[PDB]
Design a protein around this ligand. Structure first.
Ligand SMILES: Cc1c(C(=O)O)n2c3ccc(Cl)c(c13)-c1c(nn(C)c1C)CSCc1cc(n(C)n1)CSc1cc(c3ccccc3c1)OCCC2
Ligand SMILES: OC[C@H]1O[C@H](O[C@H]2[C@H](O)[C@@H](O)[C@@H](O)O[C@@H]2CO)[C@H](O)[C@@H](O)[C@@H]1O
Length: 518
């Protein structure tokens, strides 16, 4: 339950240079007498938010930057406040990757992008296009080899192809994300994923291939190509395969667009060792010697530290990494990234296995990715118009008909629940004694308990939201209207976290509208 004072516990993924990181920890111990323990738990990016929410977990968590906005939003990360001298030692765009609501919430370490890795003794020149891979596989099959194996279990590896002809996560224009505008089930995404599925149908790839299977095949000289990041180069070096690292193939004449990650280190908000952690990260790890120790274990990519990157940049494999990165897109760090990845992971796995068609898989992924924002739209608008008596005139935006009709439905059914359950609602409002924002943020734990116990149905979702409206009316009448949007956010988080899979199975809010159709 409590993080131990006077030591450092660090989590890093098991594909990274954790032995090199431990060597940095031993240098830290030699100076300070403070022991550093490096661990690489399975699913650490899922475990961290669970354990840290209880005040437990590591002092320092390493992951790509995309998960950190979610952690920061949940209050799990300490704000990072390096001095100018330190900040100037790292590239500005790396600090940008770890900025969330105006605050730095991790230290950037290195820039990662996937590349095409190829065996020059099988394939002296890499394919420039995805479309030529089937014919190459046919040539290679006659030699008792295959063209390509890569991890089909993690959507990170398949995204570059999905993105190539126009798939996107959240639209980015005019220096801004439009979180309502999700690009998972458009014609471009379908074209990419169909190409992948056709590779599998035509026995060029196997839907069961995972990281270890692809890595072993490439490193044993059994397959001519793989798709992987810099961390994989150590094991390829050890294997003695004559390998190149190059630009990903094009699809429909367009570059493959990898999602670019910045390996980052956050400090747990519950750590009593924040000063020790800052010292470790700034004055041991983010040094030429610290990064070299990690990079010698498993390569980092293009490091954030300018002095060391100037050495590393002369490596053609790093040049290739950066070429692919420039053709791709820096991942968002918005809290909705976790859901996007979960939705797309399932879509790829189901399309690849034949459990769903591409169209079915991508429709579900779209709905899953849109769920938080659409739910918040509906719930916020209902609570606010209930509180004030006046509706919001702003356009609903994307999937607007569904939002509008869900709101219209919820007006009917939710107004009814408020009337019929006035007595329970008034009683409970009095018991909970909500006076301010602090009281609203305290509701989540109890709300999750109540709502997640028992059966799942649309009626209970209506009760959740309708009591929210009942509370919002109270908040407005005591001059606490500023608490309504935090309330709506809390209710939305409870709903979507606890009922994600059920919601997607209903066609989200279209299910709700149909369920209560008069
Ligand atoms: C039965 C019921 C449900 C449900 O079926 O899941 N929900 C209610 C919401 C409110 C009420 Cl009054 C009732 C319910 C209810 C009760 N009896 N009857 C006859 C009714 C209709 C009281 S026993 C259940 C209960 C409620 C709380 N506790 C400690 N136990 C307050 S902690 C909280 C909970 C919220 C909240 C939802 C929005 C905002 C704040 C919330 C703060 O939503 C919980 C999920 C929705
Ligand atoms: O597959 C979804 C997954 O993609 C990214 O994770 C990468 C990670 O960034 C790399 O450093 C390397 O470890 O491979 C992972 C893919 O298995 C996202 O960072 C992650 O949040 C997301 O779930």
């Amino acid at each position: 339950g409590k993080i131990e004072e006077g030591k450092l516990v660090i989590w890093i993924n098991g594909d990274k240079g954790y032995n090199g990181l431990a060597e940095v920890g031993k240098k830290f111990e030699k100076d300070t007498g403070i022991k550093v323990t490096v661990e690489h738990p399975d699913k650490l990016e899922e475990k961290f938010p669970q354990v840290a929410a209880t005040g437990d977990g590591p002092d320092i968590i390493f992951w790509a930057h995309d998960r950190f906005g979610g952690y920061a939003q949940s209050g799990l990360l300490a704000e990072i406040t390096p001095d100018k001298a330190f900040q100037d030692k790292l590239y500005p765009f790396t600090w940008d990757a770890v900025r969330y609501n105006g605050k730095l919430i991790a230290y950037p370490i290195a820039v990662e992008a996937l590349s095409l890795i190829y065996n020059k003794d099988l394939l002296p020149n890499p394919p420039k296009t995805w479309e030529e891979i089937p014919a190459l596989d046919k040539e290679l099959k006659a030699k008792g080899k295959s063209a390509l194996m890569f991890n089909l279990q993690e959507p990170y590896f398949t995204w570059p192809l999905i993105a190539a002809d126009g798939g996107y996560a959240f639209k980015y224009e005019n220096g801004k994300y439009d979180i309502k505008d999700v690009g998972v089930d458009n014609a471009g995404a379908k074209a990419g994923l169909t190409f992948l599925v056709d590779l599998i149908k035509n026995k060029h790839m196997n839907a069961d291939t995972d990281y270890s299977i692809a890595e072993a095949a490439f490193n044993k000289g059994e397959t001519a190509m793989t798709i992987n990041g810099p961390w994989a180069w150590s094991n390829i070096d050890t294997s003695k395969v004559n390998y190149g690292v190059t630009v990903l193939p094009t699809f429909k004449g367009q570059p493959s667009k990898p999602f670019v990650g910045v390996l980052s280190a956050g400090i747990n908000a519950a750590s009593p060792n924040k000063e020790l952690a800052k010292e470790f990260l700034e004055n041991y790890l983010l040094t030429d010697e610290g990064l070299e120790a990690v990079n010698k274990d498993k390569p980092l990519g293009a490091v954030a530290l300018k002095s060391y990157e100037e050495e590393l940049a002369k490596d053609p494999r790093i040049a290739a990494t950066m070429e692919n990165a420039q053709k791709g897109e820096i991942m968002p760090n918005i809290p909705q990234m976790s859901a996007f990845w979960y939705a797309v992971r399932t879509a790829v796995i189901n399309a690849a296995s034949g459990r769903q068609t591409v169209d079915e898989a991508l429709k579900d992924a779209q709905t899953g990715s849109e769920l938080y924002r659409q739910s918040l739209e509906i719930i916020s608008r209902y609570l606010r118009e209930q509180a004030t008596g006046a509706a919001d005139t702003a356009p609903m935006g994307a999937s607007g008909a569904t939002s509008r009709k869900a709101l219209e439905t919820l007006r009917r059914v939710g107004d009814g629940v408020q009337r019929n359950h006035e007595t329970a609602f008034q009683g409970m409002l009095r018991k909970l004694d909500i006076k301010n924002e602090d009281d609203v943020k305290s509701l989540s734990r109890v709300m999750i308990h109540v709502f997640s116990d028992g059966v799942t149905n649309w009626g209970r979702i209506v009760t959740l939201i309708s009591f929210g409206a009942f509370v919002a009316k109270h908040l407005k009448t005591i001059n606490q209207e500023s608490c309504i949007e935090p309330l709506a956010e809390s209710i939305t988080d409870v709903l979507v976290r606890t009922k994600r899979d059920w919601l997607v199975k209903q066609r989200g809010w279209d299910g709700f509208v149909e369920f209560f159709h008069v």
